[PDB]
Amino acid sequence: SDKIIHLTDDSFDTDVLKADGAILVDFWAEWCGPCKMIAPILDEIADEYQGKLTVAKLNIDQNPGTAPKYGIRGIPTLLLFKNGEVAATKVGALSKGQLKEFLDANLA
Ligand SMILES: [Cu+2]
């Protein structure tokens, strides 16, 4: 977890919307089983894509204001932002290989 940015409702614009480069945002909660299943895969991706992608997390129990703005309905949900806008989304758990394919489809 050392390479994952900790987001809050108030820091979202500064950290995500004005980010340089692609940022992957994980919407999670402690009670969410599938969310905890993909946590290690996000750490692997953070290492593997270091320098090309920033990974971040937003706990929806602690920051309830952001999810509703993006129409999130379930967790985990992954949002891929580029240039201040959502470029792609993925709802539900997935394997490392599926995540890599999803990223590669959007990073160029
Ligand atoms: Cu770490």
From Swiss-Prot:
Disulfide-bonded cysteine pairs: these are 32-35
PROSITE patterns to which the protein is assigned, alphabetical: THIOREDOXIN_1, THIOREDOXIN_2
- Residues of the site described as Deprotonates C-terminal active site Cys: 26
PTM-bearing positions, type N6-acetyllysine: 69
Q: Which residues form the active site?
A: 32 (nucleophile), 35 (nucleophile)
All copies of the Thioredoxin domain together span: 1-108
Instruction: Identify the residue position(s) of the site Contributes to redox potential value.
Output: 33-34
Q: Pfam families, alphabetically?
A: Thioredoxin (PF00085)
The answer to whether the entry has keyword Acetylation is: yes
Q: How does it assemble?
A: Monomer. Interacts with bacteriophage T3 DNA polymerase.
**Its family?**
Belongs to the thioredoxin family.
Under what name is this protein listed?
Thioredoxin 1
